[PDB]
Amino acid sequence: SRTIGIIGAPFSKGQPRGGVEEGPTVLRKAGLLEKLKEQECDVKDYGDLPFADIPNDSPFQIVKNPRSVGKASEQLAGKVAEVKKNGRISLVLGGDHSLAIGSISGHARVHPDLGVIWVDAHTDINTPLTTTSGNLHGQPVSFLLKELKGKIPDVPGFSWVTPCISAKDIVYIGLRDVDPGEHYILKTLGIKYFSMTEVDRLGIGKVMEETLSYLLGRKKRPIHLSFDVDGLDPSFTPATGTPVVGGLTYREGLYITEEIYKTGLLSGLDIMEVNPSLGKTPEEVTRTVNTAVAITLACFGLAREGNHKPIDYL
Amino acid sequence: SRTIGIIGAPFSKGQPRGGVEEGPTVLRKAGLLEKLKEQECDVKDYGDLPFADIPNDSPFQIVKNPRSVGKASEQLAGKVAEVKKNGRISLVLGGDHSLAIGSISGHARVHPDLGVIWVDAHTDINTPLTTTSGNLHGQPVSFLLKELKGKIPDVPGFSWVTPCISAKDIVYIGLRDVDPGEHYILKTLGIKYFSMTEVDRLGIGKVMEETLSYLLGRKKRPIHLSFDVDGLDPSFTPATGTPVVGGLTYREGLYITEEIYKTGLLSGLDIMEVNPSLGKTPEEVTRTVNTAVAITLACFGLAREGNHKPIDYL
Amino acid sequence: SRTIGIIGAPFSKGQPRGGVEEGPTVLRKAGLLEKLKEQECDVKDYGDLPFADIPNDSPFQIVKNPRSVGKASEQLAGKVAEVKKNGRISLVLGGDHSLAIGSISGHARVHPDLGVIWVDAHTDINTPLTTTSGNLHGQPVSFLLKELKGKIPDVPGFSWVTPCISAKDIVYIGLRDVDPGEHYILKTLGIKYFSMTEVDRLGIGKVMEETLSYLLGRKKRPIHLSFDVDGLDPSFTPATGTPVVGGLTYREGLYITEEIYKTGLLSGLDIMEVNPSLGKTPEEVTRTVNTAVAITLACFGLAREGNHKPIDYL
Ligand SMILES: N[C@](CCCC[B-](O)(O)O)(CCN1CCCCC1)C(=O)O
Numbered sequence: 001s002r003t004i005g006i007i008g009a010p011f012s013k014g015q016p017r018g019g020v021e022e023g024p025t026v027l028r029k030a031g032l033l034e035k036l037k038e039q040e041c042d043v044k045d046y047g048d049l050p051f052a053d054i055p056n057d058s059p060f061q062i063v064k065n066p067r068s069v070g071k072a073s074e075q076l077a078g079k080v081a082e083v084k085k086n087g088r089i090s091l092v093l094g095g096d097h098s099l100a101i102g103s104i105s106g107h108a109r110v111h112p113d114l115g116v117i118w119v120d121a122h123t124d125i126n127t128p129l130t131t132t133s134g135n136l137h138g139q140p141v142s143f144l145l146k147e148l149k150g151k152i153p154d155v156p157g158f159s160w161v162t163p164c165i166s167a168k169d170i171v172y173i174g175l176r177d178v179d180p181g182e183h184y185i186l187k188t189l190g191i192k193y194f195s196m197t198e199v200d201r202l203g204i205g206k207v208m209e210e211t212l213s214y215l216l217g218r219k220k221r222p223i224h225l226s227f228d229v230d231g232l233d234p235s236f237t238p239a240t241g242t243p244v245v246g247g248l249t250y251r252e253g254l255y256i257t258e259e260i261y262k263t264g265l266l267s268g269l270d271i272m273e274v275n276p277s278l279g280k281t282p283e284e285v286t287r288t289v290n291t292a293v294a295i296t297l298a299c300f301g302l303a304r305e306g307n308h309k310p311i312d313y314l
Numbered sequence: 315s316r317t318i319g320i321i322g323a324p325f326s327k328g329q330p331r332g333g334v335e336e337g338p339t340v341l342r343k344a345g346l347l348e349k350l351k352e353q354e355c356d357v358k359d360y361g362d363l364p365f366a367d368i369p370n371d372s373p374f375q376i377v378k379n380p381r382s383v384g385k386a387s388e389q390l391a392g393k394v395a396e397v398k399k400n401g402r403i404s405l406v407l408g409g410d411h412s413l414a415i416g417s418i419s420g421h422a423r424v425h426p427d428l429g430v431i432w433v434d435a436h437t438d439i440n441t442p443l444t445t446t447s448g449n450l451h452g453q454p455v456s457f458l459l460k461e462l463k464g465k466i467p468d469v470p471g472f473s474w475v476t477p478c479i480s481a482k483d484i485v486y487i488g489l490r491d492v493d494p495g496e497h498y499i500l501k502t503l504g505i506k507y508f509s510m511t512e513v514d515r516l517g518i519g520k521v522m523e524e525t526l527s528y529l530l531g532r533k534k535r536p537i538h539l540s541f542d543v544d545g546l547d548p549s550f551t552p553a554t555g556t557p558v559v560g561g562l563t564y565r566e567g568l569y570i571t572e573e574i575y576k577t578g579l580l581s582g583l584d585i586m587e588v589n590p591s592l593g594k595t596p597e598e599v600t601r602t603v604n605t606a607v608a609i610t611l612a613c614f615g616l617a618r619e620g621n622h623k624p625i626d627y628l
Numbered sequence: 629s630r631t632i633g634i635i636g637a638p639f640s641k642g643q644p645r646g647g648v649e650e651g652p653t654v655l656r657k658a659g660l661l662e663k664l665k666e667q668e669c670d671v672k673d674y675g676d677l678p679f680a681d682i683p684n685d686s687p688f689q690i691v692k693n694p695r696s697v698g699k700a701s702e703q704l705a706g707k708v709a710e711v712k713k714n715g716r717i718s719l720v721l722g723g724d725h726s727l728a729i730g731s732i733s734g735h736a737r738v739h740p741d742l743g744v745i746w747v748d749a750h751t752d753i754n755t756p757l758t759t760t761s762g763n764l765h766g767q768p769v770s771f772l773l774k775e776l777k778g779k780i781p782d783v784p785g786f787s788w789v790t791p792c793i794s795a796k797d798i799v800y801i802g803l804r805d806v807d808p809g810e811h812y813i814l815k816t817l818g819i820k821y822f823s824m825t826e827v828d829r830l831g832i833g834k835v836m837e838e839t840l841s842y843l844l845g846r847k848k849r850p851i852h853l854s855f856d857v858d859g860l861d862p863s864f865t866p867a868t869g870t871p872v873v874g875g876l877t878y879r880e881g882l883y884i885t886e887e888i889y890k891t892g893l894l895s896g897l898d899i900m901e902v903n904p905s906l907g908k909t910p911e912e913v914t915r916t917v918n919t920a921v922a923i924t925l926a927c928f929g930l931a932r933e934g935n936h937k938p939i940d941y942l
Pocket residue numbers: 096097098120121122123124126131132133134135137138139177179228230242273
């Protein structure tokens with residue numbers, strides 16, 4: 001049975017806009033925990049993380065808020081490892097995507113053999129040196145990849161980081177706004193990716209087959225799904241900081257997560273970048289939160305074909 | 315040549331909301347009959363059915379308005395059988411989906427070998443015992459299936475019903491909100507279905523190929539298409555009683571119906587659950603009615619590639 | 629390297645509505661030339677064409693503004709041939725689609741072996757005799773096809789036209805509103821087409837593979853892409869004169885143009901039928917222009933997976 005440990009991560013300093021901190025709150029108030037319980041799920045809530053203010057946090061070169069971002073991820077890694085040791089699937093409610101450094105790092109402490117599926121409009125693989133924005137939510141993958149050690153400078157706040165995945169252990173789905181440095185890294189390291197071009201070419205059906213065969217073909221292993229809500233088209237998730245048109249549909253989002261659930265190997269989940277304050281209308285917030293909840297429920301067994309308990313309904 | 319008998323079925327008591335009775339009216343005022351004539355069609359209008367008021371209709375256990383629903387379907391079955399005996403394709407304008415009991419039953423009197431394609435967000439296969447709503451528009455398939463006789467109680471109003479299809483004679487397309495009891499029946503009886511998950515997996519092209527091969531592979535036979543407008547996404551058909559997000563697109567809807575037309579075997583058609591009173595704006599009503607008309611026109615030969623008469627246009 | 633010659637064609641008299649003349653202006657003000665320069669491109673601007681007023685232009689039978697349309701295309705053919713002789717890809721900003729007579733004709737003077745890809749909701753293949761509207765933007769293909777000479781009357785303004793393509797040298801993508809005479813011609817001449825039905829059936833991936841294999845399988849040759857913005861769904865390009873629902877998505881539009889870019893054979897491009905005055909809101913205009921610019925940028929190398937210069941980014 002599929003058993004979850006919920007971790008709230010109200011953190012925003014990996015990017016400029018403030019409202020992403022309210023991510024955990026609006027998802028919970030949408031009745032996420034209750035809805036999980038209403039399906040097959042054993043849910044334990046490990047609460048929202050207290051991220052202390054680090055008021056003295058001047059840029060490292062162009063990299064903004066490095067100490068705050070680093071500490072938040074350090075804290076999150078500790079909590080994720082704790083929930084994993086308790087035999088539960090970690091469900092991190094973000095919060096900006098810089099937290100993926102902490103989420104994946106903590107997960108990997110307990111399950112070093114994890115494979116990562118990254119659903120996003122962006123690769124989030126800028127280094128502190130290639131970034132032109134300095135926003136750390138556009139950099140987390142570079143901190144995790146072994147191949148890029150010695151390319152990442154000693155950024156204050158990140159001394160605790162030990163890269164825990166290789167180029168072969170991650171697959172991107174949804175990419176349509178990739179920086180030139182990022183594209184260079186992508187091609188250089190030979191990372192498997194399905195940009196929107198590939199999804200258009202192959203269909204999401206083949207994308208998922210290829211994705212799961214790629215990661216699980218050799219050996220079954222724990223899956224970490226890091227889901228940036230901006231992976232989906234802004235017509236479905238508008239209340240987010242860096243929306244890009246031409247995204248994955250609602251249907252494609254549910255297909256990805258249904259197929260992932262059915263492997264029985266989902267081990268860690270990030271639901272990131274929901275910013276209710278960026279909704280142009282109340283309905284836009286509602287639509288974004290509703291979609292994020294739907295995505296989450298699919299990850300833990302809710303199937304569009306229907307679900308039933310193991311009894312005779314007739 | 316493709317020859318039609320139109321039957322209006324202004325009936326609503328299979329569900330709570332009243333405006334679905336206006337279905338026939340708004341479709342006709344959209345110029346449906348004229349547009350059919352403007353393509354290849356021989357159209358006879360058998361008028362709107364007069365459904366008498368049965369004011370004494372207390373629930374049967376939780377099942378609501380059983381006598382009214384039963385009589386409406388009994389009447390409709392008689393009219394459908396009449397149009398079929400006249401060598402015409404019955405076109406039923408609904409009205410709520412409980413009327414499918416009458417439509418399919420009457421059709422099957424004349425053509426017992428029919429196969430059913432059911433386009434819907436829902437399976438509509440609750441029994442009077444499994445339903446939690448009591449709304450009969452969520453139950454019609456259970457009354458039609460031979461396998462489920464002895465599971466259906468003697469509901470007042472339905473003594474005339476004799477189940478006329480087996481589990482193998484129906485294919486669902488579009489399913490994304492299926493009750494647990496319904497999912498149990500679906501899996502137990504081995505009914506062929508393409509939920510939105512399958513449509514996402516395979517593409518509507520393969521779905522239609524599989525659907526038609528399934529029903530027609532052994533032997534050519536009459537097709538009954540029961541089309542709930544909520545099968546399509548609410549972005550296309552919002553003025554309907556039980557909308558569910560993540561539906562079939564407009565394009566997928568036309569593809570389904572184009573492919574069905576081209577078999578030359580369409581024998582019965584239901585266009586159900588249009589409720590103009592549920593449109594949030596006049597445009598939403600217009601959009602819903604326009605889409606329903608477009609779907610209908612495709613069923614009778616209107617092709618997106620173009621149509622032409624058998625002459626030399628040059 | 630991919631090298632462009634921009635030609636503004638502010639012309640509207642191939643159809644009734646006036647604002648399409650502002651096409652070049654709003655695309656340029658959207659920063660199109662700058663954005664092309666911001667990617668790999670050598671851009672020369674050959675300016676906007678001065679189309680003299682021909683006030684004496686009474687209908688030829690039902691065909692409207694024949695002399696004005698004919699002269700505009702004659703002028704455009706001269707400019708396109710000039711840019712082609714200069715070793716550049718002609719980029720024509722329309723303007724209504726009647727200008728395709730001039731664009732393709734001029735291109736073909738320099739590269740007689742061109743193949744045409746026509747992205748549109750319409751076939752634009754009515755002759756002056758089959759048209760029921762008389763609008764010349766619905767007729768340009770008939771003037772270009774060799775097979776139809778002797779079917780085209782001596783329309784004033786078009787004596788300069790010499791048909792330059794055969795039935796085999798054109799592929800349509802996007803068709804969903806085709807007149808009966810047009811469908812007759814399509815089927816009679818055996819022209820390759822992918823209506824929305826085929827796109828639904830096969831997926832845009834297979835459509836592009838088949839399209840390019842069809843045109844380029846035997847021999848590599850220059851490609852002319854004539855892109856009517858109404859090929860895309862009106863949810864993406866609403867500010868256009870003849871919108872039709874159920875169109876190609878934004879994603880499909882970018883996939884078509886990405887795949888075309890990657891052949892290295894794009895030789896001529898038309899971006900047609902943008903009419904800012906038909907936007908119901910400022911945002912609709914913006915959305916239409918934004919989409920058209922995005923389509924154009926994809927034709928000249930902008931890839932959703934990312935782009936990078938030939939250096940070491942690390
Ligand atoms: N690549 C960006 C966006 C990162 C998004 C983070 B994610 O996916 O968690 O939301 C954007 C860089 N871009 C450079 C030029 C254009 C504007 C900013 C960056 O800041 O590095």
